[PDB]
Amino acid sequence: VQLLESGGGLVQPGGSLRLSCAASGFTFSSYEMNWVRQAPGKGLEWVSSISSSSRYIYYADSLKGRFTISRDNSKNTLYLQMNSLRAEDTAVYYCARSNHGAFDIWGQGTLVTVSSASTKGPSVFPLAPSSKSTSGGTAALGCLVKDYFPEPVTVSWNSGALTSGVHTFPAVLQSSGLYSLSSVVTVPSSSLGTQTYICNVNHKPSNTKVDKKVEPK
Amino acid sequence: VQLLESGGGLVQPGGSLRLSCAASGFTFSSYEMNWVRQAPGKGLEWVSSISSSSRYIYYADSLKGRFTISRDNSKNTLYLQMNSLRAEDTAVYYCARSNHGAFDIWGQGTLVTVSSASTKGPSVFPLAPSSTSGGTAALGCLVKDYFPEPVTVSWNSGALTSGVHTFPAVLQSSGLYSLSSVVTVPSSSLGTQTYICNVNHKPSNTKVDKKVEPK
Amino acid sequence: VLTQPPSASGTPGQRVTISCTGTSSYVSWYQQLPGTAPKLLIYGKNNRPSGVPNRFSGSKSGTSASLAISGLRSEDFADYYCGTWDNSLNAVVFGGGTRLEIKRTVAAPSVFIFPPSDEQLKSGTASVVCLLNNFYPREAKVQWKVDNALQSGNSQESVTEQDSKDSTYSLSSTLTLSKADYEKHKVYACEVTHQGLSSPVTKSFNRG
Amino acid sequence: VLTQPPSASGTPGQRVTISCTGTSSIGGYNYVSWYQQLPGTAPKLLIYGKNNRPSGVPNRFSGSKSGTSASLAISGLRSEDFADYYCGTWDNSLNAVVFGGGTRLEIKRTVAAPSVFIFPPSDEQLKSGTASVVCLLNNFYPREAKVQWKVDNALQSGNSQESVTEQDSKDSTYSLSSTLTLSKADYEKHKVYACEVTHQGLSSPVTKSFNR
Ligand SMILES: CN[C@@H](C)Cc1ccc2c(c1)OCO2
């Protein structure tokens, strides 16, 4: 059983957005489907619920009716319409199933960012390993992704061929209003002269795909 | 009865590719055919199926409609169109004949690698004998830093097969593949027999015959 | 209408109890693994769905219940959440969320320093990164010294989640200055203080 | 839906069984098929329908179905049976073809100590500016092994990779190779190199080295 959400993204305050959840592996019409959201760095919050074949519908007062839940039982799809969106609605939204009085199937979630800030691709800079690496063979290298918005951003090394010692740090929101993080991998020093290291950074919100070579200096 | 697949190769992510399967020995127009893939180091996964009359077609839901199956009954051929290729699509693709309720006849498979890395011919370095506690002598060839798969290694144009071990290719952190082929021979024959490794990487059109001599 | 302890530490192989105070009860517990969607742990005490390990157990207890975790293992790093259904308002309540720190042995951090790239320097800004890798506990002190003068304040720290295989942590301190400010000093150093160090460690470098 | 155990070991001449567990929590009343895949070869059809065998499948292969679960029986094991075994059916809750995880058949054999070999980095390879050292573990059993590197008595880590061949179809043993990734600089930092292997079939860890 899989539940995949789509439609989340960056919208301005007061706008509207429609999210969809597609289910697989179970009878959609025979189960109840709910929406639950989580603010960045905050707790979980129930949003809405709908019964089998659109029998019973429930929401919460924190959203003063701005949200509308529906389902196409003949299409195994659930929809959530958000109107008069506010900055407080920014969060990751999940679709969940109700089986025995609790949520047993959760979706991966979709991020909705409500803000007047504009999208911007990130800049990738090399954190070049150099003489100031040493550490008895455990040299470090990496790439700095800076000044990007909205979230998120994904980083890989050598198209995925390098995964051991990789640490991609949580995004930090700078005073500029943009996000910045770094991805650093630790490798044996002896391997510096026998391999080229490239950071593959993907920022889908801005259609950014950058491969940056990290050379020692 | 035989089934041969073709069209596999290296393609950039998001590209297209058409795979063809040719049958020779059975009434192709009288059987339903299928495409099934196996990813490197993973299990089998069904892809698509087409009936004899091209009336019923089923695809795996994970494809998102990126694949399109077809068949030419007039020419005994089966076709698969792969669009918006992803890294997950990298695998060996087989055609099969659905007789009764299973896959009766299988093809030999065709490798499809989806990656942005460029084709790289391997470097072949001899691994000469030294010292051995085994009373034998192990000598071989190192095929390093090549892409994509596969690489085939023989010894003395196929004459020498006994005691040969060609290791599975290991994808290094560098993004390139590497392997070693080693044969153990009686140590008394080191100075009176020629040992040649024939390494063929058809991608990149590399064929190298390297002689291993003690040193 | 549900409350959850902010934090809950543990040791490998031990047992941890996470409480969820409420007005009444059936409390259902969920786990939020680092960077992943929540998963269902227990419909009700001893009613764990398929897949969830038997190590987790519930406790049906009147108004206030709790969740018990035995055989504390690595992957148990997560924020745990409790939830019921207040039929009074026909709404689903949720807990504050408890973070599980899996106590491990003290691990010294590896300190790395990275000067600013010429690519960035051409852009008018200069960023400097100090890296603390695979240390325990999380608490550590990273200090930026530009010409022996503390510069913390223009820096910004990011800390990874508790690694499952090692239970360690990683931390990056980034010092950001303009090109002019960067060009007005020579000595740039990062100094780290942590439980696993007897003498403070310093990774330095010069502009040239 | 279909679940298969990862590995299953047998004894030559003896009998071995492999299980393909289904689920209805999906459904059943489907026909489960069995396929065999030897290393480096496309799958071969073993069983289809009600314990039927096509053409070349011997009498030593049979398949049973009981509820949402089917099993494969291989009586009279041979070293040539070393392969990966899969099961397949036609799900109707998904209207697709579902395959099992597959099981790695591993016929047992006597405990075999490896014949260790060490190879010096190539003259050409050093010219390119890199040094690779190959440590060979030949025809040992069981699979588990532990290879360690030392250069001028300097222990290493995280700078080598190893590949292990499939179980041999005749002797049923394994051969393993481990390569060390060094560059001309670090290589010339030392002149003596060695490999230390410790295996169950071995009495005491062995070491082989070269001087140059
Ligand atoms: C879509 N054609 C189907 C009906 C043929 C089929 C059915 C069951 C199978 C199978 C193939 O492979 C193994 O289990």
mmCIF file of N, CA and C in Angstrom, chain D residues 56-152:
data_model
loop_
_atom_site.group_PDB
_atom_site.id
_atom_site.type_symbol
_atom_site.label_atom_id
_atom_site.label_comp_id
_atom_site.label_asym_id
_atom_site.label_seq_id
_atom_site.Cartn_x
_atom_site.Cartn_y
_atom_site.Cartn_z
ATOM 1 N N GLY D 56 13.112 -30.037 -20.082
ATOM 2 C CA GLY D 56 14.353 -30.486 -19.476
ATOM 3 C C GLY D 56 14.389 -30.530 -17.964
ATOM 4 N N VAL D 57 13.368 -30.016 -17.285
ATOM 5 C CA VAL D 57 13.371 -30.008 -15.824
ATOM 6 C C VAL D 57 13.331 -31.448 -15.326
ATOM 7 N N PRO D 58 14.304 -31.879 -14.520
ATOM 8 C CA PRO D 58 14.312 -33.271 -14.049
ATOM 9 C C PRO D 58 13.201 -33.561 -13.052
ATOM 10 N N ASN D 59 13.150 -34.801 -12.561
ATOM 11 C CA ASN D 59 12.158 -35.200 -11.572
ATOM 12 C C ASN D 59 12.488 -34.705 -10.170
ATOM 13 N N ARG D 60 13.676 -34.139 -9.966
ATOM 14 C CA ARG D 60 14.099 -33.655 -8.659
ATOM 15 C C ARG D 60 13.468 -32.320 -8.283
ATOM 16 N N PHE D 61 12.675 -31.723 -9.171
ATOM 17 C CA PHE D 61 12.026 -30.442 -8.921
ATOM 18 C C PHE D 61 10.518 -30.639 -8.874
ATOM 19 N N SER D 62 9.892 -30.155 -7.803
ATOM 20 C CA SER D 62 8.445 -30.225 -7.660
ATOM 21 C C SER D 62 7.962 -29.000 -6.899
ATOM 22 N N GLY D 63 6.732 -28.599 -7.176
ATOM 23 C CA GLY D 63 6.149 -27.427 -6.542
ATOM 24 C C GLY D 63 4.789 -27.726 -5.955
ATOM 25 N N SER D 64 4.563 -27.223 -4.744
ATOM 26 C CA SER D 64 3.323 -27.446 -4.017
ATOM 27 C C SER D 64 2.673 -26.113 -3.671
ATOM 28 N N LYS D 65 1.347 -26.135 -3.541
ATOM 29 C CA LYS D 65 0.575 -24.950 -3.192
ATOM 30 C C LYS D 65 -0.445 -25.322 -2.128
ATOM 31 N N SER D 66 -0.486 -24.544 -1.046
ATOM 32 C CA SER D 66 -1.417 -24.780 0.055
ATOM 33 C C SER D 66 -1.847 -23.430 0.609
ATOM 34 N N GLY D 67 -3.081 -23.027 0.309
ATOM 35 C CA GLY D 67 -3.526 -21.713 0.727
ATOM 36 C C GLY D 67 -2.748 -20.621 0.012
ATOM 37 N N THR D 68 -2.547 -19.507 0.713
ATOM 38 C CA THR D 68 -1.764 -18.406 0.165
ATOM 39 C C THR D 68 -0.276 -18.658 0.375
ATOM 40 N N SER D 69 0.206 -19.819 -0.067
ATOM 41 C CA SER D 69 1.605 -20.183 0.113
ATOM 42 C C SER D 69 1.985 -21.358 -0.780
ATOM 43 N N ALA D 70 3.134 -21.261 -1.443
ATOM 44 C CA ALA D 70 3.641 -22.321 -2.301
ATOM 45 C C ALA D 70 5.098 -22.591 -1.959
ATOM 46 N N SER D 71 5.532 -23.825 -2.208
ATOM 47 C CA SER D 71 6.884 -24.242 -1.872
ATOM 48 C C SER D 71 7.483 -25.039 -3.020
ATOM 49 N N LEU D 72 8.809 -24.982 -3.123
ATOM 50 C CA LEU D 72 9.566 -25.719 -4.124
ATOM 51 C C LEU D 72 10.477 -26.714 -3.420
ATOM 52 N N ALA D 73 10.479 -27.955 -3.897
ATOM 53 C CA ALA D 73 11.278 -29.024 -3.315
ATOM 54 C C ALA D 73 12.345 -29.461 -4.309
ATOM 55 N N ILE D 74 13.593 -29.481 -3.858
ATOM 56 C CA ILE D 74 14.727 -29.900 -4.680
ATOM 57 C C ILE D 74 15.377 -31.077 -3.960
ATOM 58 N N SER D 75 14.980 -32.290 -4.334
ATOM 59 C CA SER D 75 15.543 -33.501 -3.755
ATOM 60 C C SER D 75 16.703 -33.997 -4.608
ATOM 61 N N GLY D 76 17.765 -34.445 -3.942
ATOM 62 C CA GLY D 76 18.956 -34.881 -4.643
ATOM 63 C C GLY D 76 19.784 -33.712 -5.130
ATOM 64 N N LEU D 77 20.270 -32.902 -4.192
ATOM 65 C CA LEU D 77 20.977 -31.681 -4.542
ATOM 66 C C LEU D 77 22.295 -31.985 -5.244
ATOM 67 N N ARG D 78 22.662 -31.100 -6.168
ATOM 68 C CA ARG D 78 23.954 -31.132 -6.834
ATOM 69 C C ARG D 78 24.562 -29.736 -6.788
ATOM 70 N N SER D 79 25.890 -29.679 -6.900
ATOM 71 C CA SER D 79 26.565 -28.385 -6.908
ATOM 72 C C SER D 79 26.077 -27.507 -8.051
ATOM 73 N N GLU D 80 25.621 -28.119 -9.146
ATOM 74 C CA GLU D 80 25.098 -27.368 -10.279
ATOM 75 C C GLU D 80 23.768 -26.690 -9.977
ATOM 76 N N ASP D 81 23.124 -27.028 -8.859
ATOM 77 C CA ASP D 81 21.877 -26.382 -8.474
ATOM 78 C C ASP D 81 22.093 -25.028 -7.811
ATOM 79 N N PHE D 82 23.339 -24.647 -7.532
ATOM 80 C CA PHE D 82 23.614 -23.316 -7.009
ATOM 81 C C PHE D 82 23.045 -22.263 -7.949
ATOM 82 N N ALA D 83 22.050 -21.515 -7.488
ATOM 83 C CA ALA D 83 21.403 -20.501 -8.315
ATOM 84 C C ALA D 83 20.432 -19.723 -7.437
ATOM 85 N N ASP D 84 19.745 -18.765 -8.052
ATOM 86 C CA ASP D 84 18.710 -17.981 -7.397
ATOM 87 C C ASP D 84 17.353 -18.443 -7.911
ATOM 88 N N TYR D 85 16.419 -18.669 -6.994
ATOM 89 C CA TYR D 85 15.118 -19.239 -7.317
ATOM 90 C C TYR D 85 14.026 -18.215 -7.049
ATOM 91 N N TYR D 86 13.137 -18.036 -8.023
ATOM 92 C CA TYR D 86 12.067 -17.053 -7.951
ATOM 93 C C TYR D 86 10.715 -17.727 -8.146
ATOM 94 N N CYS D 87 9.672 -17.061 -7.654
ATOM 95 C CA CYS D 87 8.297 -17.501 -7.835
ATOM 96 C C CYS D 87 7.478 -16.359 -8.420
ATOM 97 N N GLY D 88 6.503 -16.709 -9.248
ATOM 98 C CA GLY D 88 5.673 -15.712 -9.898
ATOM 99 C C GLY D 88 4.250 -16.200 -10.060
ATOM 100 N N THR D 89 3.319 -15.253 -9.980
ATOM 101 C CA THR D 89 1.898 -15.518 -10.156
ATOM 102 C C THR D 89 1.284 -14.333 -10.895
ATOM 103 N N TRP D 90 -0.045 -14.304 -10.959
ATOM 104 C CA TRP D 90 -0.784 -13.206 -11.583
ATOM 105 C C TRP D 90 -1.755 -12.637 -10.552
ATOM 106 N N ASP D 91 -1.363 -11.538 -9.915
ATOM 107 C CA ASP D 91 -2.236 -10.878 -8.955
ATOM 108 C C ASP D 91 -3.442 -10.271 -9.660
ATOM 109 N N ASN D 92 -4.614 -10.419 -9.042
ATOM 110 C CA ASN D 92 -5.826 -9.790 -9.547
ATOM 111 C C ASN D 92 -6.210 -8.536 -8.777
ATOM 112 N N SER D 93 -5.771 -8.406 -7.524
ATOM 113 C CA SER D 93 -5.936 -7.147 -6.808
ATOM 114 C C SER D 93 -5.102 -6.034 -7.427
ATOM 115 N N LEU D 94 -4.124 -6.385 -8.264
ATOM 116 C CA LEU D 94 -3.329 -5.416 -8.998
ATOM 117 C C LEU D 94 -3.341 -5.639 -10.504
ATOM 118 N N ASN D 95 -3.853 -6.776 -10.976
ATOM 119 C CA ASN D 95 -3.902 -7.083 -12.405
ATOM 120 C C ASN D 95 -2.516 -6.995 -13.039
ATOM 121 N N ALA D 96 -1.504 -7.435 -12.299
ATOM 122 C CA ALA D 96 -0.120 -7.409 -12.748
ATOM 123 C C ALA D 96 0.538 -8.742 -12.418
ATOM 124 N N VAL D 97 1.821 -8.850 -12.749
ATOM 125 C CA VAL D 97 2.614 -10.044 -12.483
ATOM 126 C C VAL D 97 3.594 -9.709 -11.367
ATOM 127 N N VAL D 98 3.497 -10.437 -10.259
ATOM 128 C CA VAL D 98 4.311 -10.195 -9.072
ATOM 129 C C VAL D 98 5.341 -11.309 -8.953
ATOM 130 N N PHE D 99 6.585 -10.930 -8.673
ATOM 131 C CA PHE D 99 7.678 -11.869 -8.484
ATOM 132 C C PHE D 99 8.113 -11.876 -7.024
ATOM 133 N N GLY D 100 8.651 -13.013 -6.590
ATOM 134 C CA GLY D 100 9.181 -13.116 -5.249
ATOM 135 C C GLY D 100 10.556 -12.491 -5.124
ATOM 136 N N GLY D 101 11.001 -12.356 -3.875
ATOM 137 C CA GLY D 101 12.320 -11.795 -3.633
ATOM 138 C C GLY D 101 13.431 -12.646 -4.214
ATOM 139 N N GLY D 102 13.263 -13.958 -4.182
ATOM 140 C CA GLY D 102 14.273 -14.872 -4.670
ATOM 141 C C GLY D 102 15.150 -15.396 -3.548
ATOM 142 N N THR D 103 15.572 -16.650 -3.685
ATOM 143 C CA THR D 103 16.403 -17.313 -2.693
ATOM 144 C C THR D 103 17.715 -17.750 -3.328
ATOM 145 N N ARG D 104 18.812 -17.530 -2.607
ATOM 146 C CA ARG D 104 20.144 -17.917 -3.068
ATOM 147 C C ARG D 104 20.448 -19.306 -2.523
ATOM 148 N N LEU D 105 20.292 -20.321 -3.370
ATOM 149 C CA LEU D 105 20.607 -21.683 -2.963
ATOM 150 C C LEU D 105 22.111 -21.830 -2.768
ATOM 151 N N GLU D 106 22.504 -22.412 -1.636
ATOM 152 C CA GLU D 106 23.911 -22.568 -1.266
ATOM 153 C C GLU D 106 24.115 -23.992 -0.762
ATOM 154 N N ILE D 107 24.501 -24.893 -1.666
ATOM 155 C CA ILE D 107 24.782 -26.266 -1.270
ATOM 156 C C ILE D 107 26.042 -26.289 -0.417
ATOM 157 N N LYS D 108 25.977 -26.992 0.710
ATOM 158 C CA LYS D 108 27.072 -26.994 1.664
ATOM 159 C C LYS D 108 28.223 -27.870 1.176
ATOM 160 N N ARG D 109 29.399 -27.629 1.751
ATOM 161 C CA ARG D 109 30.604 -28.367 1.404
ATOM 162 C C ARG D 109 31.554 -28.324 2.595
ATOM 163 N N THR D 110 32.683 -29.011 2.459
ATOM 164 C CA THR D 110 33.657 -29.065 3.539
ATOM 165 C C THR D 110 34.319 -27.705 3.735
ATOM 166 N N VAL D 111 34.761 -27.454 4.966
ATOM 167 C CA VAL D 111 35.439 -26.203 5.283
ATOM 168 C C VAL D 111 36.769 -26.164 4.540
ATOM 169 N N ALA D 112 36.972 -25.116 3.747
ATOM 170 C CA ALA D 112 38.121 -25.008 2.858
ATOM 171 C C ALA D 112 38.897 -23.740 3.179
ATOM 172 N N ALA D 113 40.182 -23.895 3.484
ATOM 173 C CA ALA D 113 41.028 -22.734 3.714
ATOM 174 C C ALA D 113 41.379 -22.067 2.385
ATOM 175 N N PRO D 114 41.481 -20.742 2.358
ATOM 176 C CA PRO D 114 41.839 -20.054 1.116
ATOM 177 C C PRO D 114 43.322 -20.165 0.809
ATOM 178 N N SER D 115 43.637 -20.085 -0.483
ATOM 179 C CA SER D 115 45.015 -20.005 -0.963
ATOM 180 C C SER D 115 45.281 -18.543 -1.298
ATOM 181 N N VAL D 116 45.960 -17.846 -0.393
ATOM 182 C CA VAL D 116 46.097 -16.397 -0.483
ATOM 183 C C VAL D 116 47.198 -16.034 -1.470
ATOM 184 N N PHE D 117 46.969 -14.961 -2.223
ATOM 185 C CA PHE D 117 47.951 -14.424 -3.153
ATOM 186 C C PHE D 117 47.978 -12.908 -3.027
ATOM 187 N N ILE D 118 49.131 -12.324 -3.340
ATOM 188 C CA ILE D 118 49.322 -10.879 -3.299
ATOM 189 C C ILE D 118 49.965 -10.436 -4.604
ATOM 190 N N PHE D 119 49.524 -9.287 -5.117
ATOM 191 C CA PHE D 119 49.954 -8.809 -6.421
ATOM 192 C C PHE D 119 50.506 -7.395 -6.297
ATOM 193 N N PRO D 120 51.667 -7.112 -6.879
ATOM 194 C CA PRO D 120 52.237 -5.765 -6.800
ATOM 195 C C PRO D 120 51.565 -4.830 -7.789
ATOM 196 N N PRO D 121 51.435 -3.549 -7.447
ATOM 197 C CA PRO D 121 50.882 -2.588 -8.406
ATOM 198 C C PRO D 121 51.681 -2.582 -9.700
ATOM 199 N N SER D 122 50.969 -2.429 -10.812
ATOM 200 C CA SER D 122 51.569 -2.609 -12.125
ATOM 201 C C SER D 122 52.517 -1.463 -12.474
ATOM 202 N N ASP D 123 53.504 -1.783 -13.312
ATOM 203 C CA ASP D 123 54.425 -0.765 -13.807
ATOM 204 C C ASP D 123 53.677 0.319 -14.573
ATOM 205 N N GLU D 124 52.751 -0.085 -15.447
ATOM 206 C CA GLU D 124 51.942 0.892 -16.168
ATOM 207 C C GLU D 124 51.054 1.682 -15.217
ATOM 208 N N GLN D 125 50.440 1.003 -14.245
ATOM 209 C CA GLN D 125 49.533 1.685 -13.328
ATOM 210 C C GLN D 125 50.261 2.759 -12.532
ATOM 211 N N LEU D 126 51.485 2.471 -12.083
ATOM 212 C CA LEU D 126 52.249 3.486 -11.365
ATOM 213 C C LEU D 126 52.580 4.676 -12.259
ATOM 214 N N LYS D 127 52.802 4.438 -13.555
ATOM 215 C CA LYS D 127 53.040 5.546 -14.475
ATOM 216 C C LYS D 127 51.830 6.469 -14.545
ATOM 217 N N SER D 128 50.624 5.899 -14.527
ATOM 218 C CA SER D 128 49.409 6.704 -14.533
ATOM 219 C C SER D 128 49.223 7.497 -13.246
ATOM 220 N N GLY D 129 49.995 7.207 -12.204
ATOM 221 C CA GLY D 129 49.889 7.938 -10.957
ATOM 222 C C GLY D 129 49.011 7.305 -9.903
ATOM 223 N N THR D 130 48.655 6.032 -10.054
ATOM 224 C CA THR D 130 47.827 5.334 -9.083
ATOM 225 C C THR D 130 48.422 3.963 -8.793
ATOM 226 N N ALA D 131 48.105 3.442 -7.609
ATOM 227 C CA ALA D 131 48.595 2.143 -7.163
ATOM 228 C C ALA D 131 47.423 1.320 -6.653
ATOM 229 N N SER D 132 47.222 0.147 -7.247
ATOM 230 C CA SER D 132 46.192 -0.792 -6.824
ATOM 231 C C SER D 132 46.851 -2.112 -6.454
ATOM 232 N N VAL D 133 46.554 -2.605 -5.256
ATOM 233 C CA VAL D 133 47.097 -3.861 -4.756
ATOM 234 C C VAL D 133 45.952 -4.854 -4.628
ATOM 235 N N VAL D 134 46.135 -6.042 -5.196
ATOM 236 C CA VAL D 134 45.095 -7.063 -5.250
ATOM 237 C C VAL D 134 45.475 -8.184 -4.292
ATOM 238 N N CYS D 135 44.587 -8.474 -3.347
ATOM 239 C CA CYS D 135 44.730 -9.596 -2.428
ATOM 240 C C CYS D 135 43.717 -10.659 -2.831
ATOM 241 N N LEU D 136 44.203 -11.859 -3.132
ATOM 242 C CA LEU D 136 43.374 -12.921 -3.686
ATOM 243 C C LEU D 136 43.121 -13.996 -2.639
ATOM 244 N N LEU D 137 41.848 -14.339 -2.451
ATOM 245 C CA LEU D 137 41.429 -15.465 -1.624
ATOM 246 C C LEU D 137 40.765 -16.473 -2.553
ATOM 247 N N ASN D 138 41.416 -17.614 -2.757
ATOM 248 C CA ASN D 138 41.059 -18.543 -3.822
ATOM 249 C C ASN D 138 40.498 -19.833 -3.237
ATOM 250 N N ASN D 139 39.290 -20.196 -3.666
ATOM 251 C CA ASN D 139 38.703 -21.508 -3.404
ATOM 252 C C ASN D 139 38.676 -21.826 -1.908
ATOM 253 N N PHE D 140 37.900 -21.034 -1.176
ATOM 254 C CA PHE D 140 37.721 -21.214 0.256
ATOM 255 C C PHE D 140 36.248 -21.454 0.569
ATOM 256 N N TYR D 141 35.978 -21.793 1.829
ATOM 257 C CA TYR D 141 34.618 -22.044 2.288
ATOM 258 C C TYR D 141 34.590 -22.101 3.812
ATOM 259 N N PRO D 142 33.564 -21.527 4.459
ATOM 260 C CA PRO D 142 32.427 -20.876 3.800
ATOM 261 C C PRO D 142 32.736 -19.465 3.296
ATOM 262 N N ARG D 143 31.682 -18.723 2.948
ATOM 263 C CA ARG D 143 31.860 -17.431 2.290
ATOM 264 C C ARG D 143 32.558 -16.422 3.195
ATOM 265 N N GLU D 144 32.235 -16.430 4.487
ATOM 266 C CA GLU D 144 32.757 -15.410 5.389
ATOM 267 C C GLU D 144 34.280 -15.381 5.356
ATOM 268 N N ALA D 145 34.832 -14.171 5.316
ATOM 269 C CA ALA D 145 36.276 -13.979 5.290
ATOM 270 C C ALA D 145 36.584 -12.599 5.853
ATOM 271 N N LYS D 146 37.864 -12.365 6.128
ATOM 272 C CA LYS D 146 38.293 -11.110 6.743
ATOM 273 C C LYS D 146 39.673 -10.760 6.206
ATOM 274 N N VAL D 147 39.729 -9.771 5.316
ATOM 275 C CA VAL D 147 40.967 -9.355 4.667
ATOM 276 C C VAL D 147 41.438 -8.054 5.298
ATOM 277 N N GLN D 148 42.728 -7.986 5.620
ATOM 278 C CA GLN D 148 43.329 -6.805 6.221
ATOM 279 C C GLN D 148 44.567 -6.401 5.434
ATOM 280 N N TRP D 149 44.841 -5.100 5.422
ATOM 281 C CA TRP D 149 45.937 -4.536 4.651
ATOM 282 C C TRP D 149 46.972 -3.914 5.578
ATOM 283 N N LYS D 150 48.228 -3.947 5.137
ATOM 284 C CA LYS D 150 49.335 -3.381 5.897
ATOM 285 C C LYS D 150 50.446 -2.997 4.933
ATOM 286 N N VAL D 151 50.926 -1.761 5.048
ATOM 287 C CA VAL D 151 51.994 -1.241 4.202
ATOM 288 C C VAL D 151 53.105 -0.739 5.113
ATOM 289 N N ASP D 152 54.279 -1.366 5.026
ATOM 290 C CA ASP D 152 55.376 -1.079 5.949
ATOM 291 C C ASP D 152 54.903 -1.199 7.394
#
